Amino acid sequence: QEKRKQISVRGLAGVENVTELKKNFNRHLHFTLVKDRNVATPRDYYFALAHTVRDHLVGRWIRTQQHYYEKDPKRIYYLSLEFYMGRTLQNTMVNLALENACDEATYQLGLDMEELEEIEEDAGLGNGGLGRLAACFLDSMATLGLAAYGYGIRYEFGIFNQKICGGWQMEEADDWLRYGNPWEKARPEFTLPVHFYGRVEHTSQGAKWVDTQVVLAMPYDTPVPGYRNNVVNTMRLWSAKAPNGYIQAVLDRNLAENISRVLYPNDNFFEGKELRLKQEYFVVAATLQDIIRRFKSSKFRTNFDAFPDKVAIQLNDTHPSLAIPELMRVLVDLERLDWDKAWEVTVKTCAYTNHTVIPEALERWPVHLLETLLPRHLQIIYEINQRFLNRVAAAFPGDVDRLRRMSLVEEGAVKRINMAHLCIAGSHAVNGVARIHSEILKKTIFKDFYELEPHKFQNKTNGITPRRWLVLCNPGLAEIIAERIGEEYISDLDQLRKLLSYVDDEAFIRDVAKVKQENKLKFAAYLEREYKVHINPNSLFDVQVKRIHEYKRQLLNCLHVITLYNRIKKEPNKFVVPRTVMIGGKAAPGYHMAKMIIKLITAIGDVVNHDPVVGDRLRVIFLENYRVSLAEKVIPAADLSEQISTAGTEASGTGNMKFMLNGALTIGTMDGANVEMAEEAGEENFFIFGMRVEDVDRLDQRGYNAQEYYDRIPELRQIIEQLSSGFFSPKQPDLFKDIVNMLMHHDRFKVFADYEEYVKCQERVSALYKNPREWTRMVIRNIATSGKFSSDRTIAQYAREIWGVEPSRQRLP
Amino acid sequence: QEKRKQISVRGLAGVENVTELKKNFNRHLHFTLVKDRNVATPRDYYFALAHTVRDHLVGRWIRTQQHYYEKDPKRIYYLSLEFYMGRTLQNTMVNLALENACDEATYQLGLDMEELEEIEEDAGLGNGGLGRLAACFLDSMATLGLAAYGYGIRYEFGIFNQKICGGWQMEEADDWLRYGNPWEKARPEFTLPVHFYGRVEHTSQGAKWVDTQVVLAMPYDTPVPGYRNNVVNTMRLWSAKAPNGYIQAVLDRNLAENISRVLYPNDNFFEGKELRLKQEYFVVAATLQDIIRRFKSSKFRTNFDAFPDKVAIQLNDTHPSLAIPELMRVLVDLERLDWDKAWEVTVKTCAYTNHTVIPEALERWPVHLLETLLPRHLQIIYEINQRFLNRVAAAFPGDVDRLRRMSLVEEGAVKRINMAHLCIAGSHAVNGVARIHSEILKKTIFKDFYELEPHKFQNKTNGITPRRWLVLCNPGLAEIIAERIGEEYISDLDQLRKLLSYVDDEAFIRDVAKVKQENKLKFAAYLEREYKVHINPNSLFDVQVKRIHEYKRQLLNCLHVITLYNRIKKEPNKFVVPRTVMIGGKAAPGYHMAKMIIKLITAIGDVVNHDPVVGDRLRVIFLENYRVSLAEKVIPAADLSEQISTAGTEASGTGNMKFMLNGALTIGTMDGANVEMAEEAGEENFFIFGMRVEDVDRLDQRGYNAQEYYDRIPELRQIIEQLSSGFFSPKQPDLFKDIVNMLMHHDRFKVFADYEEYVKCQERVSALYKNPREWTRMVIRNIATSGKFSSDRTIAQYAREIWGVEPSRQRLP
């Protein structure tokens, strides 16, 4: 209670507030939960607290939304098929300044608030970085006072819960709604219809989309609180409902209700299932009906010319790209605008954000599927394509191959629509998510488009919210910073640059170190308690946590780990800096190599963790079920952050920024936002290694030959021979033959090309770690220059450079 | 507001209570609903009222349940696959004495409480009489202070909503949960597992049921308030949940969740679907786990001998009959009791109520299905059968045909288990639901069983609650009665016999008549408003409302209606008492003849209602979507109650009692509880006609020949010739050929045999109706002798004669 008390960033425990909070906790326990103190469990107490905390959002939510309707500012509609929100109780209390008051109120009731917070399920409606970016963006938009609306789908099952059984991943449905969600509000009264299939009738009123099947879209609205500004915006997620022999017809309502059943668990990989396309159109269609209704009730041919002055649609990836043709369908077929005026409006309303580089991560839907499911949309896409290729032909006359490359329609045995090209043609702005990625979009990936319309192309380096990713998850660090520079940095993170004044301050050096040690102790206690794994608290915590994907190269980290193990065995008496290497992350079901990688991590640990010569000098653990609530516990405890993707493959990364803000040093390639992070802190304060993008390209030009590296590096050959001969799988000697085959003959990500410099860089890490004072001084140089990586900076640049609206920190009454 | 005010039976509007109710309405509107007075609709105001009213049930619910756990009285478990509860807001306010206070509170807020009550959806978890009996029984059990628990299944879809399209029934899913159910409380924490399929392993610990598939049973608990006694019991309904490639496995969770999806819409007809058997075992299995847990936490080999002293299981029909073998399975396989002691306990715990006569309404499950789905239960049933047939053989030595007739196992191409015989063997009491039906169970249907164990056989004449079926639905009548004899009759209905003192009281005669006229005006306004049908308010309202079934003979009512029409056309100048004949009721989907009957009613109206000679002297309407909330509006408005089943087919009826309590006179056969109703009022005050059961049997003995009636009755022949030649279906002349064929050659219910006496009796009705004073005096003789038909009388006799517990009207603090 004592540290919680002491933490001034957690606010005040005013005596009347504490009294009111207690009263309301007991009121909810009785009237809402219908429980009594003799039978109540810790889960019942968590719900009573959550309902109490929620009541504090209500007046601000109704007043904020009423303010927008009165004032009529331009509205921002952020459309996304993922929102990885995490848990909400602590975030709500931080943003409303209720944390110490609730801590005191619950303490007076005989309860431990932190134990109650652990009952909450993450809302895990996203796969990883992109879903988590959308959640940091809704927080930043509310903190910056924008009239912003996140729109998505309410999946009944989010990303699966990962169990590890016999060292392998197993997927279990994440039934996050089992005990209810006290944060959302069902809005059945605002249910709207969404159409599928059918056919187009061309008459004298234009086209008519008829004979469709209807699925209803019921919205659930969740409040999104800004940081101490009394703004509460809304996330509206749509849930699928069947329209309004006999038994079997009732049971068959499940087919339409299956649209919102489960998140597709792919990360940087397009799976073209019809059910996903349905999910996409379902979000787009219901969402554009709200946009159009709100526009018509706003101010006021008069109306649609001003539509782009009052609406921005922000497409998160191409997942909601059908908003481009759906808006044209509504404006032309239903509102009766002429095509040209409708297209003018559509392009000024929409903007697209791209988050990938790999060709197989782009959405390319078969024309036959679009024809069957959304026949009027395919007509509209072909017309969009003919007018855009007419502009290409007039700008670059006679360049026939440019027409083929830029077309929305891709040739082949199955013709497809390239949804990225559709977004570029229909948006006034296109952006990537880190300077290197935005630049490669202009130079290579979409170079023809950039040449046609260079003003469309922008950069918006990603960021993370310093509320969840510093005040909530690492209050100790938040408090020692506040002790020196006040609290303003929480909503103005560039003020962390003031911490460079303390690089030679003995107390500050002391306290940064003390906070990291406390977080390592809290993490080790969580691991012993919840998963019964024991880790050495006096070891360097070396952490690689992110989805499992060949491009992120968890395998390169495996090679390093086995190198440390083999070096210890060769020279057992030689001192080495003790390490706890932790790797965690989910594999898409169906991505075989990623599943084998998880099994290799566990298998390495099975040998390494039981070798008496190694003892506690080296431990390798796989962290099960990596997810936002676990990132909040392990990132603050980390010493080394592994950001080792092959140069050119991580479009930005965001876990890299989380670690930098939480006092870890980074070992990484010049990839994604790592380049900007190293620029901000100074490259001498980062452990950059390996090929740069120019090097990777040179290797591709002459041909990547993994055998050359195997032949020239004895230590590498040793590990490959261990893997192949069954040293890490004695009961099934050929278990890892597929990983070896890939590494030796088909590695698109050049794991062996960075092995030598990776292992050398790791040694430099270890050498600095032996000097605690200078390790900590380099940490202070990182925390103090992490300010650019606030999502408030990123959202302020979307507002000013894309949406045309000015962000504000002015408090609402 | 004025009559509402004046109605003293509606309680007091205390000034502080009105103030508190208003405060709490606004609090719920803001914090619970997240609405504000500018956007709030009548639906939002209904929910704010419902949440306010619900808060008044909470303390009594927690205190009542705590009282049982402390005091440890014998607990009554009433198991039923149907609970036709209807709407709850008004019932809750009546039982808690909040009706005038809420009426005043809402009136001060500018709202009309009666309009808000109309927003509520009936909870229509039952088909008709049997489901509605279970709901009147839960009310009576709470009013009599019993520690009773109703246990059922929470169907997502209850009985379908009936639309009439082109004069035919159409079924629509009744999505009663769309806007939520504010009355229930989800209890996910108390979810339990239910097993299916698998196989039995016989070991040295006895049998072991292994390799099963699990479906979870999540309970939802709904409060059940007694009448002004502060008792609030619980209805617990179980909801199916799946246990704890990849996408398809998540979607396939729907298969297990389909167990609680929809009510089978059959009335007096067994459909042997596997999914229904699953529904049955799901209720039984989860329910017996609660019973056993509660017993073990109660008092205290010691334990199970006292099990029948602390538990009663009441089986509503054979639908939960699997409780007999499930209890033996739990006691023998899991608790390790020996078979004999377990059977002793099981028979003293269980009791069965039978509600049907027709052979096809009895449950007979294929042994192959039971073998596949519930292999240990089939083993147990065969053992139960062998020991029971050993008792039969020792009691009646050498009677081999008795063994075949009484066996639980029925022979044939498909062998089946007769669930009624299983209940009789495993229960200490068996009862029918009206004296004539209980007697036929002993004399014919289960005569061998009665001869073996005569002490098991009982009678429990059905009843209805006078709360919903008099105070709620007909406050005007409730008030004129209270004016004379106080309010005690509401929970002691035999006090209505005091009203026989007023058969010659001019004011009372005047006011009974005035109340009926007001109800007819309210009903006619509802019909004009909601369905846009116009009825003549100065006509005799002749009402037949009940499920559509050949045995209930809506067709006999059709023949009468056409007879009136044909008699008018023959002698147009002759005065006749104007009538509005209304028939309503649902047909099971799939029951062809019942669907054709609905179409014949509409078709008759299509001719009759547009004939200028008839004008407003005769109108015939089909009332769409007959359901508990509609019965509460039309029964109080009725003048004549049609209860015309063939003698011997309606086991009791309950709509007959509703009409008697609400001031209608009855035209009926000596069938079911009609016989007891006529006994109570005096046969001179009832319009009894037709064959008695002895007559029906004599006709069966010589052979029913419908042609004889056609040949001897000119007026009947005329109608049959109209039907056959297309007079009621000119565009499709042969439309009713199937109804004619059945009537003429395959009528199991002898419609033509009662035609002549039915039409004569109807004329006697009409003659009395021409003398308003003497019609009303005969109504007073009916209302005043309706007291035996209170469900409190019926439940007091179950408590004393079957459950061994004493009912009480003592108030809880």
Ligand SMILES: O=C1NC(=O)[C@@]2(N1)O[C@H](CO)[C@@H](O)[C@H](O)[C@H]2O
């Ligand atoms: O498909 C993707 N999943 C991601 O996490 C991703 N693209 O988007 C993120 C948010 O822009 C990026 O930071 C990450 O580099 C990229 O892989």
Ligand SMILES: O=C1NC(=O)[C@@]2(N1)O[C@H](CO)[C@@H](O)[C@H](O)[C@H]2O
């Ligand atoms: O299967 C049935 N449905 C009914 O309504 C029924 N049996 O049960 C009721 C309740 O006991 C009876 O009143 C009714 O006569 C009988 O048909």
